[PDB]
Amino acid sequence: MLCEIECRALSTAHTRLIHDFEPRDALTYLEGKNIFTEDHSELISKMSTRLERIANFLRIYRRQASELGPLIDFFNYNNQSHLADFLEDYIDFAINEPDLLRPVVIAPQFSRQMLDRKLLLGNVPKQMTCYIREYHVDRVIKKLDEMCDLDSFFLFLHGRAGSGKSVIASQALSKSDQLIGINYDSIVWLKDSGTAPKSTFDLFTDILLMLKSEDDLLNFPSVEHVTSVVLKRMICNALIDRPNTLFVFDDVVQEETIRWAQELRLRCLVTTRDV
Amino acid sequence: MLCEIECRALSTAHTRLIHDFEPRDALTYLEGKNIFTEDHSELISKMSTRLERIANFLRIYRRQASELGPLIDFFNYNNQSHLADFLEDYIDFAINEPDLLRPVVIAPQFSRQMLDRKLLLGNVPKQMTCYIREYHVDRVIKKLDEMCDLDSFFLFLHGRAGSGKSVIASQALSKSDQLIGINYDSIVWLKDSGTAPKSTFDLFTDILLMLKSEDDLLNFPSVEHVTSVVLKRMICNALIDRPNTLFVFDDVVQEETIRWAQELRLRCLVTTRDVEISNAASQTCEFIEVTSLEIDECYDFLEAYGMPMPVGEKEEDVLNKTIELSSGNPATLMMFFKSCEPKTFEKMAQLNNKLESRGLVGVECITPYSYKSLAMALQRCVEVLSDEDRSALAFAVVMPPGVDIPVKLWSCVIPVDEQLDDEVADRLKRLSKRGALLSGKRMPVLTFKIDHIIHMFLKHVVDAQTIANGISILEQRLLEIETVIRPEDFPKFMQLHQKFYDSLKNFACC
Amino acid sequence: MLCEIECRALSTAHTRLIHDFEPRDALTYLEGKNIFTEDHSELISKMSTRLERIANFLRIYRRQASELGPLIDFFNYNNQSHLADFLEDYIDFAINEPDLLRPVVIAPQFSRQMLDRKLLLGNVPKQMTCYIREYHVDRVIKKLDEMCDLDSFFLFLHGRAGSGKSVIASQALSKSDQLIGINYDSIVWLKDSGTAPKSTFDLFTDILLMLKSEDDLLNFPSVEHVTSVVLKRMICNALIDRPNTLFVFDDVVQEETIRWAQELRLRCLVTTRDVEISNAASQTCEFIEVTSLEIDECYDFLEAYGMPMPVGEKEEDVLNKTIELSSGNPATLMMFFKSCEPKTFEKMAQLNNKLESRGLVGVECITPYSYKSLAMALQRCVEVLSDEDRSALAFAVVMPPGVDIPVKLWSCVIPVLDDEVADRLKRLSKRGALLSGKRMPVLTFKIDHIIHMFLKHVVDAQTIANGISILEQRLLEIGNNNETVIRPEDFPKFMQLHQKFYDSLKNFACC
Amino acid sequence: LFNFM
Amino acid sequence: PLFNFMG
Ligand SMILES: Nc1ncnc2c1ncn2[C@@H]1O[C@H](COP(=O)(O)OP(=O)(O)OP(=O)(O)O)[C@@H](O)[C@H]1O
Ligand SMILES: Nc1ncnc2c1ncn2[C@@H]1O[C@H](COP(=O)(O)OP(=O)(O)OP(=O)(O)O)[C@@H](O)[C@H]1O
Ligand SMILES: Nc1ncnc2c1ncn2[C@@H]1O[C@H](COP(=O)(O)OP(=O)(O)OP(=O)(O)O)[C@@H](O)[C@H]1O
Ligand SMILES: [Mg+2]
Ligand SMILES: [Mg+2]
Ligand SMILES: [Mg+2]
């Protein structure tokens, strides 16, 4: 298999790999340097359009070869050197440099991404604007950054009632661009306010659904009946698709919440009154 | 069909079978060597994503082939030889050179980020960090390493209630990088706590479901109603895809669990309070007892979470009071810390007072323990007791705690349906064995002892009458004709222990 | 079609048939020597990859040709002779030799196959290890081998309750490697314990499912409703996929089981307590009786789990007290061990006391046995009993246990030429091994000790003293008519010989 | 007879 | 009573 840089190269150079190329030209050469097979090559050699031979050459190639060598050492010989120069230049801009781009910005207007799209879909409320408590929103953002490395943690933004905690959490995740995107991939903000004993399970049921794809919200079952251990397993399951994910638990009252959050090894912001 | 070794190879080598492979590449090469069927090949040939064809290829394959031959003889031909070389390496460092398997072909791929994934998916609770009991977690890991070869076995991590067992198991599967990956491929950690007779089946329903793939969690049938023989068979079925799988059974009370676990030839860690459930198993049974926290370890535990160490003599005494009171017990010590508010040694002695004049309810608190106070725990342990043993326990109140005392001296307060009272010893043994309520000590003379926590449990918990009745019923036999046991020249006068008796008699005029 | 050897050749030589070959080269030659067809050959000649032409040449070839000739006589001519030499050599290593491999071993670690995989999937329990009864497990394995040829048969591993039968069956199928793999292909071990009339059908329902593939356990229907003849047909159906299959029927109580097993022409091992269920089967019925643990095997059994062997004479006597009481019985011996706590001979004799003055309830413990005490087991063995046999047994309390005594000496206490007493006592030993027959010196029976202290704290407190009186009565009426030695007929008139124990029993009823 | 068998 | 509701 390749990796992120080399697949970024095979992906980046596609506008180019379509204007001039043909995989049959390379099939013998890869059947040769021992990186292909005559059924693989059968699959790629009898294909009606060239976009076929190209898409199969790029899918099929990534499994057999230990690296992206016998394709730079080919666009050279094939008078298609304008390809292999771009690719060797890129391999030099990665083998020869310990610096690239980090998690930052190169396709701007995260203003509709992070602000609009991700905040909104995680049900984060529309941050307050006409007044901001500097100190607190600041320390929240800080103390969230210090922990973006961590696997699971509690940040307790605790105070009096109506003391303004939730609003400040609204603001700390809506101001910056780091917390969502740089430090954490996604956001899930859920209000608890659970008092009954059935409430702490219902909560993580709607987490489990805050997680689920736009596809299969239709398929939603009579999920109401299934043990807690199964909902828990289903969450920490569906939690694979979620690298660095932040959880806001607005207005927690029951410590059963916090216990589930800690069995489920979640990363949690918590607005609450009882400390 | 394969087995646990060949499947341990197929499971260990999965990050790779995901990085470079395709089951379509192998279907044609395999219908030939006689390992498939046209529905098998139908099921694996039409699948939208590849992880589907791979999970179906490894499921159907682990069932179909007489051996793991026609899969080495394929990654080879397909230039994915970088795979078949790895698997032939594992099978060779398996049949011919054993032992060498863990250091050589298994270890060079450990990764402290894959573990947390495996722990989490096996629902292992987050290991404790601000203090670790070196010895026990160490010996657990050692004794687990010694048995990973074995096909099925019981390790019983048994102790008092709140004695700290489960946490230690959490740490023992979280310390090393060996136990998961090197010694065992996967973990399933399930808390039992089953009391109903239906509980022991529901548990293994959720084992069976802890096993099942994220796919076909959708498909769960009305299995709630399905025989025991079928849940068992369904498990040992779905258990093929699980080479060396470890089972933590946190807090087992019913020996029906242990019987299923041993019929299912499972590899089990078992945290429990009642130790005798192991009599259910005719097998390799090995034990690790979580004793009460020694006096020095308590210091370590306090320092560990930031507690100011004494200076004055009556401050080290305040803390020896706590250590004496909570007769070395993690959970009540923790509730104690969590409840020490100002942090002062002073308010700590305040609590030291509160414990004698309000029992555990004086220091009951929100703690990492599922329980407000150790009494909610001892509750169950006391209900489960054989009715007669329930009686013996109910009476061991009127003793002196943290004092080693002879059996006949017990024969006085303790009930029985002649002249040899050994029956007292039989009951007191069941009684320490089953929740660690007593304390046996063979020589100089056959003596037991009631600890301090296990006493103030009974204080504010048994019927107000039975105390004064046991005290008088004691004062009757009381006459007939330090690190030193009380001699037989001096039993007629228990007056040595008047203090802790002046306290119950004051207690019982209220 | 080919056969097992020749298809083993076409299967064995595949790593080879892939490196150098092409079926088109052969198509004309097979279209020619009359073993193919031009659509067959069409199917194989226009195929994109070579692995296609090869897999179709090997599937398609096996139907048309009477043998594997026109393919050896081809790899020769095609400069691919390195193939045809391997294949002619193999055909020589089969046409020319009446010897190959038999059912044995050439891919080792049947240790995870037969031990782990097949035993476990057939729900066979995890064989005992710290002690094995040689003789019995041995004869089981033997008598199973002798029959691996047979189409259906009953092996009755019958004995007392807790006598250890199931454990021995566990061991006989978990030790060897022959029984599973060599002699029989698969194992199915199912516990009966059926008492209701609905139980014997439910059993074979879970057989039918013990059989079913990992696929279609999902498809399990509301199968609960379908006639017995249909479940039976469904089993003997699904039984095609099962060449030489062994059936263990652990703990059978109802003879309806045995009848279904015999209508379904099954091969059966049976652990049971009641021996007469074999009269249900009209067949080679073969038997292995599980006797009481001999005094020396009891020693072996004690040593085996670490119990210290005697020294003083009244310590070997203390342990002969135990071996005498639990009249050689695995289960109660085990409960006994599990409950001997400190391990001392002292606390052991303590239990020896506890047993006479509190009965079996005195040593009841957590044991690998499903039963808290052997009395819970014998319970059932006693309920099934004919009402009249229930009576005879209920009265045999007032006898001397571990004493060989005449039929007439029994006719005094037992209800109704009174040989009929003997007939009942026979039914009674046959059906739970509750008694003990001994043909000569004189037709005499005997009641053991375990089978007594069951009855002590179990029969009506009155009926004890009444049996004692009904005896002292008919004894006296016999009085009015006028060691390795049986009690003579000049001396039945005084049961006072056993006065000691008779004196104890009496205190129990009268108080 | 037989206290619950 | 014989136990304040067992504890
Ligand atoms: N910038 C601000 N900071 C704090 N509070 C504000 C701000 N702007 C308006 N408020 C008012 O204060 C109210 C209380 O804020 P908030 O909802 O955060 O309370 P809370 O901390 O969530 O209390 P609880 O947890 O009990 O709901 C808001 O609903 C709003 O009416
Ligand atoms: N190593 C440790 N570090 C910090 N705290 C501990 C540790 N061990 C125990 N404790 C404290 O004691 C409490 C009880 O621990 P634990 O849950 O392990 O008890 P347990 O042995 O499982 O008892 P039970 O079997 O009754 O559940 C914990 O919740 C924690 O508060
Ligand atoms: N090697 C052994 N042989 C026989 N019995 C043993 C052995 N080891 C332990 N035992 C004890 O003897 C008990 C009785 O054995 P087993 O379960 O085979 O009785 P059984 O013959 O099946 O009686 P039933 O058919 O009435 O259940 C076992 O549960 C176990 O406690
Ligand atoms: Mg709020
Ligand atoms: Mg626990
Ligand atoms: Mg049995």
User: What are the backbone dihedrals phi and psi of residue A269, each rounded to the nearest 5 degrees, phi first?
Assistant: -90, 145
Question: Kindly report the CA angle at C482 between C479 and C485, in degrees rounded to 5?
Answer: 65
Q: Say yes or no: CB of residue B136 within 6 Å of ligand 2.
A: no
Residue located nearest, by CA, to atom 11 of ligand 1: A164
Ligand nearest to the CA of A248: 4
User: What are the backbone dihedrals phi and psi of residue B156, each rounded to the nearest 5 degrees, phi first?
Assistant: -105, 105
> Hey, what amino acid is at B134?
E
Let me know if B315 is exposed, middle or buried by CB neighbors in 10 A (0-12, 13-18, 19+): middle
Which residues have C-beta within 8 Å of that of residue B297, sequence separation ≥ 6?
A: B133, B328
Residues of chain A contacting B210 with CB distance shorter than 8 Å: 229, 233
| Protein fold of A110-275 | Rossmann fold (3.40.50)
Q: Which residues of A194-206 are buried (b: 16+ CB within 10 A; e: fewer)?
A: beeeeebbebbbe
Residues of chain B contacting A237 with CB distance shorter than 8 Å: 121, 214, 217
Element (H, E) at C26: helix C24-32
Nearest C-alpha in D relative to C384: D5
* Cα atoms found within 13 Å of the Cα of residue A141, Cβ hemisphere only: 19
Q: Which of B410, B393, B401 is nearest to B491 (CA)?
A: B410
Second CATH level (architecture) for the domain B110-290: 3-Layer(aba) Sandwich (3.40)
- CA–CA distance, B192 with B203 (Å, rounded to integer): 7
Q: Ligand 4 centre and the CA of A272: distance in Å?
A: 7
- CA–CA distance, D1 with C395 (Å, rounded to integer): 10
* DSSP character at residue B247: E
Q: Are C220 and C243 in contact (CB under 8 A)?
A: no
Neighbours of D4 (CB within 10 A): 6
- CA–CA distance, A50 with A24 (Å, rounded to integer): 10
Residue C9, both tokens: 């050749």
Resolution in angstrom units:
4.2
Q: Are A63 and A1 in contact (CB under 8 A)?
A: yes
- CA–CA distance, A64 with B19 (Å, rounded to integer): 10
Nearest C-alpha in D relative to C387: D1
- CA–CA distance, B87 with B69 (Å, rounded to integer): 10
Which residues have C-beta within 8 Å of that of residue B15, sequence separation ≥ 6?
A: B109
> Tokens 């593939």 identify what position?
C213
Which residues have C-beta within 8 Å of that of residue B162, sequence separation ≥ 6?
A: B329, B330, B331, B332, B369, B371, B374, B377
Q: Is C166 annotated as a binding residue?
A: yes
* DSSP character at residue C401: B
- CA–CA distance, B276 with A37 (Å, rounded to integer): 62
For residue B57, CA distances in Å to A6, B24, B471 come to 29, 9, 73
Among positive and negative, which fits the CA dihedral B353, B356, B357, B359? positive
In chain E, breaks (C-N over 2.5 A) are found after: none
Interface of B with E in 158-217 (CB under 8 A): none
- Counting other chains too, the contacts that C297-304 makes at CB distance below 8 Å and 24 or more residues apart are C297/C133, C297/C328, C298/C323, C298/C328, C298/C333, C300/C131, C301/C131, C301/C330, C301/C333, C302/C337, C304/C130, C304/C131
Let me know if B172 is exposed, middle or buried by CB neighbors in 10 A (0-12, 13-18, 19+): buried
What are C156's strand-pairing partners?
C270, C287
Q: Are A205 and A219 in contact (CB under 8 A)?
A: no
* Cα atoms found within 13 Å of the Cα of residue B261, Cβ hemisphere only: 33
* HEC readout, B318-345: HHHHHHHHCCCCHHHHHHHHHCCCCCCH
**Chains in contact with C via at least 3 Cβ–Cβ pairs below 8 Å:** A, B, D
Element (H, E) at A245: strand A245-252
What is the experimental method? X-ray
> CATH code for B371-504?
1.10.10.10
Q: Coil, strand, or helix at residue A77?
A: coil
Element (H, E) at C466: helix C461-480
Q: Say yes or no: CB of residue A135 within 6 Å of ligand 1.
A: no
> CATH code for A1-109?
1.10.533.10
Question: Kindly report the CA angle at C169 between B6 and C118, in degrees rounded to 5?
Answer: 20
Partner-chain residue, chosen from B383, B390, B462, that has the shortest CB–CB distance to E4: B462
Q: Coil, strand, or helix at residue B156?
A: strand
Residues of chain C contacting D1 with CB distance shorter than 8 Å: 390-391, 394, 459-460, 463
- CA–CA distance, C132 with C69 (Å, rounded to integer): 55
CATH superfamily for domain C291-370:
Ced-4 linker helical domain-like (1.10.8.490)
In chain A, what are the domain boundaries? Answer: 1-109, 110-275
Among positive and negative, which fits the CA dihedral B303, B304, B307, B308? positive
Mutate to test the pocket of ligand 3, among C129, C189, C192, C369 (most ligand atoms within 8 A of CB): C369
Class level of CATH domain C371-505: mainly alpha
User: What are the backbone dihedrals phi and psi of residue B429, each rounded to the nearest 5 degrees, phi first?
Assistant: -70, -60
User: What are the backbone dihedrals phi and psi of residue C133, each rounded to the nearest 5 degrees, phi first?
Assistant: -80, 105
Mutate to test the pocket of ligand 1, among A126, A129, A166, A173 (most ligand atoms within 8 A of CB): A166
| Interface residues on C facing A, Cβ-Cβ cutoff 8 A | 48-51
Q: Does B275 touch chain E (CB under 8 A)?
A: no
Q: Are B272 and B251 in contact (CB under 8 A)?
A: yes
Residue A274, both tokens: 């009882």
Q: Ligand 3 centre and the CA of A183: distance in Å?
A: 62
The alpha helices in B373-498, defined as continuous H runs, are 374-383, 387-395, 408-411, 423-433, 453-459, 464-477
The alpha helices in B146-190, defined as continuous H runs, are 165-172
Residue C23, both tokens: 């079926």
What are B441's strand-pairing partners?
B447
Residues with CB under 5 A from ligand 6 (ion): C 166, 250-251, 271
Strands C153-159 and C267-272: parallel
**Cα-Cα end-to-end distance for chain D:** 8
User: What are the backbone dihedrals phi and psi of residue B490, each rounded to the nearest 5 degrees, phi first?
Assistant: -125, 25
Mutate to test the pocket of ligand 2, among B135, B160, B165, B167 (most ligand atoms within 8 A of CB): B167
Ligand nearest to the CA of B330: 2
User: What are the backbone dihedrals phi and psi of residue B287, each rounded to the nearest 5 degrees, phi first?
Assistant: -135, 145
User: What are the backbone dihedrals phi and psi of residue B420, each rounded to the nearest 5 degrees, phi first?
Assistant: -100, 105
